[PDB]
């Protein structure tokens, strides 16, 4: 079993804690936790390439995309490794995160440890938005909070 | 070449940016940067085992020690992989960091990506101190600032 963790922080109200667990090296990764301070509705949720927070979340670069694919949602074949869809917040301003993914990993070439998890301003259109930007970022807006994904006990 | 980066944050502000570069995986890692907000003198400087900052720097656990060795200085054979010695601050509250190390790595089972870099309250005695604790922590005191080590562009 391997485990990872990420503390999400930014310049405004948004903060969270996200845990990762992978029972077997070729198996799915369970992703769970909570984020507070979010507006009601969908917020894009991605692994970005660099675990670099030098100048804030912008330093993390583009979506983690080792296979040079176009942007999509987690249930699509055509997706970046980092494409984890959206988390959804209620009027309480909290998103409960509960995700299983078979494309990210905590080892090998799809490994996300040392990279940056980011929660966005707006919805990810999952590459179905019909514009050029949909196929790169999913039009999810500014980066509200982020952290580096680290090895957990 | 592999590159990594770490943003150190803690109360003070104790704040720094530390860069890592390793030209080849069988080679040394160059470590450089700046830390501000430190009291004059030596401050212990270590890679700790977990990249977990859920409850602050205490969540990072003990020194990274994959080989089950005792604590030492960077030039000692008998050391933890995470043992990077001390950074020194002058009256202007800044430590200039400039370290080359052959034991840490940015890949393999001595890899430090996804773990936590910590700068401490007091001097590391490099395992040469009077006691039990010298062989475990180097007596370097509380954790002033830390961050998770991430992959850089
Ligand atoms: C350490 N574990 C075993 C794995 C199952 N866990 C979870 N997994 C999932 C998941 F990821 F969808 F499977 N969601 C959760 C939501 C809330 C609380 C725990 C969740 C986390 C608890
Ligand atoms: C363009 N480079 C190549 C990477 C190595 N660099 C550095 N290395 C080292 C080192 F790590 F000691 F070799 N010290 C530095 C001190 C100040 C500024 C830069 C330093 C940064 C300069
Ligand atoms: Cu994103
Ligand atoms: Cu330490
Ligand atoms: Zn994407
Ligand atoms: Zn040590």
């Amino acid at each position: 079993a391997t485990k990872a963790v990420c503390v999400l922080k930014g310049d405004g109200p948004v903060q969270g804690i996200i845990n990762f667990e992978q029972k077997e090296s070729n198996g799915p990764v369970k992703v769970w936790g909570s984020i507070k301070g979010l507006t009601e509705g969908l917020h894009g949720f991605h692994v970005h390439e660099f675990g670099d927070n030098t100048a804030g979340c912008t330093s993390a670069g583009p979506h983690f995309n080792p296979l040079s694919r176009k942007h999509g949602g987690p249930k699509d074949e055509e997706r970046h490794v980092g494409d984890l869809g959206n988390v959804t917040a209620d009027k309480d301003a909290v998103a409960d995160v509960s995700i299983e993914d078979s494309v990210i990993s905590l080892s090998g070439d799809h490994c996300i440890i040392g990279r940056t998890l980011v929660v966005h301003e707006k919805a990810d259109d999952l590459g179905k938005g019909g514009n050029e930007e949909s196929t790169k970022t999913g039009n999810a807006g500014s980066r509200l909070a982020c952290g580096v994904i680290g090895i957990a006990q």
Side-chain angles (χ1 to χ4, degrees), chain A:
Chain A
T2 69
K3 298 165 213 192
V5 67
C6 187
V7 178
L8 297 171
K9 283 183 152 55
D11 294 319
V14 179
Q15 68 184 113
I17 300 184
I18 306 297
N19 304 292
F20 305 79
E21 187 159 53
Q22 187 181 32
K23 275 179 57 160
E24 308 179 291
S25 59
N26 59 10
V29 183
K30 297 202 157 58
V31 179
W32 74 99
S34 192
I35 311 172
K36 66 192 181 60
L38 285 171
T39 65
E40 184 182 29
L42 280 63
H43 295 273
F45 191 64
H46 314 121
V47 181
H48 284 244
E49 184 179 5
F50 307 121
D52 189 338
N53 199 54
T54 55
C57 305
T58 183
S59 307
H63 300 183
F64 175 51
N65 185 21
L67 283 169
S68 302
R69 294 194 191 263
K70 302 293 172 162
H71 183 74
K75 296 145 55 167
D76 303 329
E77 187 171 37
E78 192 68 17
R79 56 171 274 192
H80 304 142
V81 169
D83 290 346
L84 298 176
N86 287 291
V87 299
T88 297
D90 294 345
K91 283 285 197 207
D92 65 357
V94 180
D96 284 335
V97 181
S98 179
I99 284 174
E100 193 154 357
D101 199 71
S102 55
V103 176
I104 60 172
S105 190
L106 308 178
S107 64
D109 196 47
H110 289 201
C111 186
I112 65 175
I113 287 160
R115 302 203 186 265
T116 291
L117 186 65
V118 177
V119 63
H120 286 269
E121 188 200 354
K122 301 171 199 166
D124 194 333
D125 61 34
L126 309 191
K128 302 303 206 279
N131 50 61
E132 74 88 15
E133 291 73 25
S134 183
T135 81
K136 293 164 169 199
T137 70
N139 292 293
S142 76
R143 299 175 192 200
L144 300 190
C146 62
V148 184
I149 303 165
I151 296 166
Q153 189 179 319

